[PDB]
UniProtKB/Swiss-Prot annotation, chain A:
Protein source organism: Homo sapiens
One Gene Ontology MF term: protein-containing complex binding
Entry GO terms, CC: azurophil granule lumen; centrosome; chromatin; cytosol; endoplasmic reticulum-Golgi intermediate compartment; extracellular exosome; extracellular region; Flemming body
Subcellular location: Cytoplasmic vesicle; Cytoplasm, Cytoskeleton, Microtubule organizing center, Centrosome; Midbody; Nucleus envelope
Region listing for Interaction with CHMP1A and CHMP1B, in residue ranges: 1-116
This protein's UniProt keywords: Cell cycle, Cell division, Cytoplasm, Cytoplasmic vesicle, Cytoskeleton, Nucleus, Phosphoprotein
Protein's gene: IST1
First and last residues shown, out of full length: 53 to 187 of 364
Annotated family: Belongs to the IST1 family.
Name of the protein: IST1 homolog
Swiss-Prot record, chains B, C:
Region (Interaction with VPS4B): 171-184
Cross-referenced Pfam families: Snf7 (PF03357)
Segments of this protein annotated with the region Interaction with VTA1: 171-184
Effect of L177A: Abolishes interaction with SPAST and VPS4A
Keyword Cell membrane (UniProt): no
InterPro entries the UniProt entry points to: Snf7_fam
Name of the molecule in the record: Charged multivesicular body protein 1b
Cellular component, GO annotation: amphisome membrane; autophagosome membrane; cytosol; endosome membrane; ESCRT III complex; extracellular exosome; kinetochore; kinetochore microtubule
Interaction with IST1, as annotated region: 132-156
Its biological purpose: Probable peripherally associated component of the endosomal sorting required for transport complex III (ESCRT-III) which is involved in multivesicular bodies (MVBs) formation and sorting of endosomal cargo proteins into MVBs. MVBs contain intraluminal vesicles (ILVs) that are generated by invagination and scission from the limiting membrane of the endosome and mostly are delivered to lysosomes enabling degradation of membrane proteins, such as stimulated growth factor receptors, lysosomal enzymes and lipids.
Keywords, alphabetical: Cell cycle, Cell division, Coiled coil, Cytoplasm, Endosome, Membrane, Protein transport, Transport
Membrane topology: Peripheral membrane protein
Length: 135, 184, 184
């Protein structure tokens, strides 16, 4: 049970990395707008705010992500950068924030993980009756 | 040569010296017995008795030397253990001292750090190889058109009798565990 | 030779010295057994017993040396791991330090720059080859008239049985994607 909490967290992290990969690719696709305007476009607001929010969480693994965040704060000003990091700006992607949360997985998710792994490796497992009832 | 190795060398030497002394006595019992027979045949009974007393004397000397040699061997065998087990104990003491030093200078926290850094620096070299290869790929794009490579693969697959169509862009536990994450 | 390599060398040597001592004891149990038989046949029961006690003593010494040799080998085998894993750890430490230096002096931003420049400078060399070849082509225009080349190609194609007419100026996804751009 405690070992699958590590697996769930890494699986969520991989899903989060896929979301950030998409937002970096979006800022590259629409890099003309970034460089052209001085105001932040609506189409980019989700991407720019999320990348600034994520950088302090991810910058242990992805060192360049710090520099991306620092440049986006230099572009759209330090104050916007602070409103992003707390999501006071109300624009950071919700699924990503969930996937990088520090909370423990739900007990039913842990049990369901063990059920599926046990089934796949043909290992007898009996799940926690209390958790399966609470669900 | 250690002071104990000297004593062992001398004990081993004394054991052999006694063993040689026993062999010399035995060979002289045989020599004196031959002289008794000669003296009896010549009727020299006084000389026969002198050889008889020598034969019996050297018979008994031989057993005393043989017995003493056995005892000195038993002692030499024990000081061999003491010499060897001393060498082993000093070597272990030396290993303990060496490892105590190296486990200080590179403790497990420092090893943990070094291994983390090692892994993270090869992640970076993978990122660098990838973008060298992407550059070279774009650099020589006109030398390898995609459609020509696809057609050569399809031609070689047709010759091999392989059914896989090469132009096209050619696990369930992972899929199910993903569905679980969506369901919660 | 490292201070630990010295200790390993001495432990390996002590293990062999004990193993030789066991072999010597075994071969002397056989030698003393032969002497018991000779002494019994000659009725020398006192000498027979001295050899019997030597045979049984060297039988038991052999097992003690064999057992000690096995224990010193087991220790020598462990210090071999410590010596080798130390060499590996220092080499990894050295690699980490070297790569840390080179990843500073040529970081990925600097590599990105270098690769961009490399690609852009070979674009320029393509532009230069093209205009050297266009010059040479115009320079020797009268040596290769177009119609003569066309006729030689047609003649060689006729001989080969190839139907392609060589005088004339001899993908759909690209065409459709173009039509989309026009339609919007």
């Amino acid at each position: 049970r405690i070992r699958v909490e590590h697996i769930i967290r890494e699986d969520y992290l991989v899903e989060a990395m896929e979301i950030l990969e998409l937002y970096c690719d979006l800022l590259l696709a629409r890099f003309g707008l970034i460089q052209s305007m001085k105001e932040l476009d609506s189409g980019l607001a989700e991407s720019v705010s999320t990348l600034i929010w994520a950088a302090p969480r991810l910058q242990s693994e992805v060192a360049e992500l710090k520099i991306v965040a620092d440049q986006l704060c230099a572009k759209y000003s330090k104050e916007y950068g602070k409103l992003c990091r707390t999501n006071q700006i109300g624009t950071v992607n919700d699924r990503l924030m969930h996937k990088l949360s520090v909370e423990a997985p739900p007990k039913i998710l842990v049990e369901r993980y063990l059920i599926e792994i046990a089934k796949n490796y043909n290992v007898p497992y009996e799940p926690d009756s209390v958790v399966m009832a609470e669900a | 040569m250690s002071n104990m190795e000297k004593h062992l060398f001398n004990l081993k030497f004394a054991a052999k010296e006694l063993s040689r002394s026993a062999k010399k006595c035995d060979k002289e019992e045989k020599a004196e017995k031959a002289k008794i027979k000669k003296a009896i045949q010549k009727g020299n009974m006084e000389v026969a008795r002198i050889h008889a007393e020598n034969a019996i004397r050297q018979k008994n000397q031989a057993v005393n030397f043989l017995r003493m040699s056995a005892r000195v061997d038993a002692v030499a065998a024990r000081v061999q253990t003491a010499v060897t087990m001393g060498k082993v104990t000093k070597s272990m003491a030396g290993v303990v001292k060496s490892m105590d030093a190296t486990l200080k200078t590179m403790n497990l926290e420092k090893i943990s750090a070094l291994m983390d850094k090692f892994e993270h620096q090869f992640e970076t070299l993978d990122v660098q190889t990838q973008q060298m290869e992407d550059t070279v790929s774009s650099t020589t794009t006109l030398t390898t058109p995609q459609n020509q490579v696809d057609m050569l693969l399809q031609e070689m697959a047709d010759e091999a009798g392989l059914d896989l169509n090469m132009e096209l862009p050619q696990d369930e536990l992972s899929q199910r565990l993903a569905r679980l994450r969506d369901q919660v």
